[PDB]
Write an enzyme that holds these catalytic residues in place. Structure first.
Site, PDB file in Angstrom:
ATOM      1  N   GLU A 174     -19.394  -8.382   6.344  1.00 24.50           N
ATOM      2  CA  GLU A 174     -17.463  -8.566   6.208  1.00 24.50           C
ATOM      3  C   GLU A 174     -16.691  -9.239   7.078  1.00 24.50           C
ATOM      4  O   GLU A 174     -15.475  -9.166   6.625  1.00 24.50           O
ATOM      5  CB  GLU A 174     -17.099  -6.743   7.289  1.00 24.50           C
ATOM      6  CG  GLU A 174     -17.623  -5.710   6.576  1.00 24.50           C
ATOM      7  CD  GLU A 174     -16.715  -4.925   5.181  1.00 24.50           C
ATOM      8  OE1 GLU A 174     -15.585  -6.064   4.876  1.00 24.50           O
ATOM      9  OE2 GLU A 174     -17.411  -4.797   4.389  1.00 24.50           O
ATOM     10  N   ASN A 196      -4.084  -8.002   3.323  1.00 26.76           N
ATOM     11  CA  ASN A 196      -5.220  -7.718   2.237  1.00 26.76           C
ATOM     12  C   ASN A 196      -3.466  -7.785   0.801  1.00 26.76           C
ATOM     13  O   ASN A 196      -2.249  -7.309   1.419  1.00 26.76           O
ATOM     14  CB  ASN A 196      -5.483  -6.183   1.479  1.00 26.76           C
ATOM     15  CG  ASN A 196      -6.681  -6.701   2.633  1.00 26.76           C
ATOM     16  OD1 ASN A 196      -6.708  -5.283   3.455  1.00 26.76           O
ATOM     17  ND2 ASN A 196      -7.755  -6.657   1.577  1.00 26.76           N
ATOM     18  N   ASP A 227      -2.107  -4.974  -0.778  1.00 24.01           N
ATOM     19  CA  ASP A 227      -1.479  -3.732  -0.641  1.00 24.01           C
ATOM     20  C   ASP A 227      -0.691  -3.929   0.485  1.00 24.01           C
ATOM     21  O   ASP A 227       0.654  -2.583   1.150  1.00 24.01           O
ATOM     22  CB  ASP A 227      -1.664  -2.292  -0.510  1.00 24.01           C
ATOM     23  CG  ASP A 227      -2.648  -3.058   0.561  1.00 24.01           C
ATOM     24  OD1 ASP A 227      -3.582  -3.232   1.376  1.00 24.01           O
ATOM     25  OD2 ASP A 227      -3.736  -1.195   1.093  1.00 24.01           O
ATOM     26  N   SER A 231      -1.634  -4.626   3.736  1.00 22.28           N
ATOM     27  CA  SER A 231      -2.769  -4.136   4.511  1.00 22.28           C
ATOM     28  C   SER A 231      -3.626  -4.752   4.952  1.00 22.28           C
ATOM     29  O   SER A 231      -3.698  -5.957   4.418  1.00 22.28           O
ATOM     30  CB  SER A 231      -3.515  -2.505   4.054  1.00 22.28           C
ATOM     31  OG  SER A 231      -4.809  -3.453   2.950  1.00 22.28           O
ATOM     32  N   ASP A 268      -7.213  -6.233   7.223  1.00 17.52           N
ATOM     33  CA  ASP A 268      -8.700  -5.518   7.421  1.00 17.52           C
ATOM     34  C   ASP A 268      -9.011  -6.755   8.639  1.00 17.52           C
ATOM     35  O   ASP A 268      -8.310  -7.712   8.508  1.00 17.52           O
ATOM     36  CB  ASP A 268      -9.609  -6.243   6.284  1.00 17.52           C
ATOM     37  CG  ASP A 268     -10.114  -4.988   5.294  1.00 17.52           C
ATOM     38  OD1 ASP A 268      -8.946  -4.240   4.870  1.00 17.52           O
ATOM     39  OD2 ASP A 268     -10.883  -4.800   4.719  1.00 17.52           O
ATOM     40  N   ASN A 294      -9.486  -1.447   7.813  1.00 19.58           N
ATOM     41  CA  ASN A 294      -8.412  -0.879   6.798  1.00 19.58           C
ATOM     42  C   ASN A 294      -7.332  -0.090   7.691  1.00 19.58           C
ATOM     43  O   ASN A 294      -7.368   0.911   8.546  1.00 19.58           O
ATOM     44  CB  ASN A 294      -8.676  -0.900   5.709  1.00 19.58           C
ATOM     45  CG  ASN A 294      -7.498  -1.578   4.969  1.00 19.58           C
ATOM     46  OD1 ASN A 294      -6.424  -0.159   4.861  1.00 19.58           O
ATOM     47  ND2 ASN A 294      -7.155  -2.686   4.074  1.00 19.58           N
TER      48      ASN A 294
END
Lengths: 118, 129
Positions: free
Chosen positions: B35, B46, B48, B50, B52, B59
């Site tokens: 990750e 990301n 959308d 959002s 991370d 998220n």
């Protein structure tokens, strides 16, 4: 893709009904489930309150869920849609996609006619 | 901060991740490997809108809020800035709620692609724990 059966349902006052949703083959978790409707004589969509006449069963192994409504009157006529919700720790585009999808919808008509039962 | 591998392994053992929910320590070290690359500062935007955040890339749609993610549910009850810390506490405790959300370590896609089904013990080997 979210599969909602059936497309239409017609019932008399006093009957009950089952709408079913199936979350077609995927890795994504069914983390939770929302039901919505648009009343007959209205074009604005509101959410349903699970409990009472509104019995929900959720089967996340099979990635399915269903809404049972008992004791219908003409007040239950409308269009019903389910929406699933799939949560992930870190970003998975596949499961995010899924949180924008509603069921196809079910148009539901309840007749209150004289001398007409189940 | 960029953790070294056995350094992270020793802090995760201390934070109670070893066998937490049946998932032995290697799983956790391995997850932060794929990750974050062991980077506590890692962030990824990301499509959308959002983001991370941190060593386990948590998220902002579900777990933490950051003031610019639509519909953020903030399930861990924390600002996302907390997860970008040198101290892994915030991220660990939010990991613990995540792993308990119904889907075990399947919540982390990098985990699912690189660690699940592999000999994850290897990631604590040679760490003298």
């Amino acid at each position: 893709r979210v599969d909602q059966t059936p497309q239409t349902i017609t019932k008399e006052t006093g009957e009950s009904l089952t709408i079913n949703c199936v979350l077609r083959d995927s890795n994504c978790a069914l983390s939770s489930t929302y039901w919505y409707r648009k009343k007959s004589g209205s074009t604005n969509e509101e959410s349903i309150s699970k409990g009472g006449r509104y019995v929900e069963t959720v089967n996340s192994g099979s990635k399915s869920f269903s809404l049972r409504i008992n004791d219908l009157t003409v007040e239950d006529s409308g269009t019903y849609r389910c929406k699933p919700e799939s949560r992930y720790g870190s970003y998975d585009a596949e499961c995010a996609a899924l949180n924008d999808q509603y069921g196809g919808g079910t148009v539901v008509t309840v007749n209150a006619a004289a001398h007409h039962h189940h | 901060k960029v953790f070294g591998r056995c350094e992270l392994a020793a802090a995760m053992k201390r934070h109670g991740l070893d066998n937490y929910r049946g998932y032995s320590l290697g799983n956790w070290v391995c997850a932060a490997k794929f990750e974050s690359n062991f980077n506590t500062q890692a962030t990824n935007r990301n499509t959308d809108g959002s983001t991370d955040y941190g060593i386990l890339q948590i998220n902002s749609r579900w777990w933490c809020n950051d003031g610019r993610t639509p519909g953020s549910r903030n399930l861990c009850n924390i600002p996302c800035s907390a997860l970008l810390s040198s101290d892994i506490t915030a991220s660990v405790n939010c990991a613990k709620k995540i792993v308990s959300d119904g889907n075990g370590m399947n919540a982390w896609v990098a985990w699912r692609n690189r660690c699940k089904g592999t000999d994850v013990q290897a990631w604590i080997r040679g760490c003298r724990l």
